[PDB]
Design a protein around this ligand. Structure first.
Ligand SMILES: C=C1C[C@H](C[C@H](C)[C@H]2CC[C@H]3/C(=C/C=C4/C[C@@H](O)C[C@H](O)C4=C)CCC[C@]23C)OC1=O
Lengths: 239, 7
């Protein structure tokens, strides 16, 4: 059974996500337009930079997150940002044609579009696999916002100074997720759900290292870095 | 850091 406290955590996270994820995708209008070699780079940089902003907003609402030192906040967000973009995008991901569908043809991103941002099949192949895996878990929105939160507040990130504090927050988050599954997620959806979810977090780590490699290689070309946003360069292309 | 200011 969920405690009041645990219910309080979920309500907050659903409100946090709903404040920061717009399923009408109305803001996409503002991005540099998409063109269908590196013709999708300006549009997809804009999309990612916006999504970083939304992720920061979400992260801020996580119970305990604001109470961390400023430096630890930055470290958690810099390392997690792309992983949460990948988690959050599953909500626009469709298994009919393996694409992210954001309401209109112009904001429908398939494999070729991701390659026109400059990325290779070595990233794209595992990314789609991940999205199929995650979509087939049929997560409750409660589980989806908890997984994003647990992703962010990871004590085992390089650079983390107060790991015991980060861990204290993660555990409250983890036990909440675990208790939700048992008493609120019906079987056999509940069958091995938690371990599979934890396994997704490992996949993201791996996906992250492959994003980092391809991001470094591409944004070394100053012509490509120019096409980025200041926040992207600050979050990805820093240090 | 504009990240710091978004916090
Ligand atoms: C300039 C880039 C592109 C690359 C993006 C990677 C390859 C992936 C990760 C998630 C993918 C997508 C995510 C889709 C959305 C739309 C919506 O669901 C909101 C969500 O925040 C999101 C980013 C579709 C295009 C390629 C993306 C951005 O990383 C970079 O640094």
């Amino acid at each position: 059974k969920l405690s009041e406290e645990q219910q309080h955590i979920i309500a907050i996270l659903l409100d946090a996500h709903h404040k920061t994820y717009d399923p009408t995708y109305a803001d996409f209008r503002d991005f540099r337009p998409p063109v269908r070699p590196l013709s999708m780079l300006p549009h997809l940089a804009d999309l990612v930079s916006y999504s970083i902003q939304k992720v920061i907003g979400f992260a801020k609402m996580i119970p305990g997150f604001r109470d961390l030192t400023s430096d630890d906040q930055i470290v958690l967000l810099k390392s997690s940002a792309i992983e949460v973009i990948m988690l959050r995008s599953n909500q626009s991901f469709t298994m009919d044609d393996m694409s992210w569908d954001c309401g209109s043809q112009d904001y429908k991103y398939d494999v070729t579009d991701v390659s026109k941002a400059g990325h290779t099949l070595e990233l794209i192949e595992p990314l789609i696999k991940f999205q199929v895996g995650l979509k087939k878990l049929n997560l409750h929105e409660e589980e989806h916002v908890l997984l994003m939160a647990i992703c962010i507040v990871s004590p085992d990130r390089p650079g983390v100074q107060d790991a015991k504090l980060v861990e204290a927050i993660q555990d409250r988050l983890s036990n909440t997720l675990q208790t939700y599954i048992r008493c609120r997620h019906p079987p056999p959806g509940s069958h091995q759900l938690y371990a599979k979810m934890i396994q997704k977090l490992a996949d993201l780590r791996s996906l992250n290292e492959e994003h980092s490699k391809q991001y470094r290689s591409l944004s070394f070309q100053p012509e490509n870095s120019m096409k980025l946003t200041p926040l992207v360069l600050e979050v990805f292309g820093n240090e | 850091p504009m990240l710091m200011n978004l916090l």
